[PDB]
Design a binder for these strands. Structure first.
Length: 64
RNA sequence: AAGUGUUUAAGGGCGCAUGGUGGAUGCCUUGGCACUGGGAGCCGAUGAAGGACGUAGGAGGCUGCGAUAAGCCUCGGGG
């Protein structure tokens, strides 16, 4: 539910809010992984690339 | 009565058999060498060449990539 089309539909403020949410989620995932209580360790990569997508869409909007 | 007389192997040699070590030989190849015909003949302050440190769920090397970190977006090809 984080496809580039959806991200581009979202607004700049909404994109930054989803950006911060994904950063909080990545922080939580890192902490669970370090404590040994993250079953789906691919969540880290999924959230990292979701952050990458949010940056990419924001920078695309900044450029034009 | 005198004389004659094979008979041992601590070890060694030679040879044969049978092994070990070693990595020659033969047959190869993932790699090189010399060229041929084309492309491009420059990259860099829009920060180059080259790197240090990082980066995957897990340690390191090589590879890729830079805190968007074996990756992000768009457009194509393929299934």
């Amino acid at each position: 539910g984080t496809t580039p089309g959806e991200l581009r539909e979202l607004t700049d403020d909404e994109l930054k809010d989803k950006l911060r949410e994904s950063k909080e989620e990545l922080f939580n995932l890192r902490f669970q992984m370090a404590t040994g209580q993250l079953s789906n360790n691919r969540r880290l990569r999924t959230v990292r690339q979701e952050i990458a997508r949010v940056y990419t869409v924001l920078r695309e909007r900044e450029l034009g």
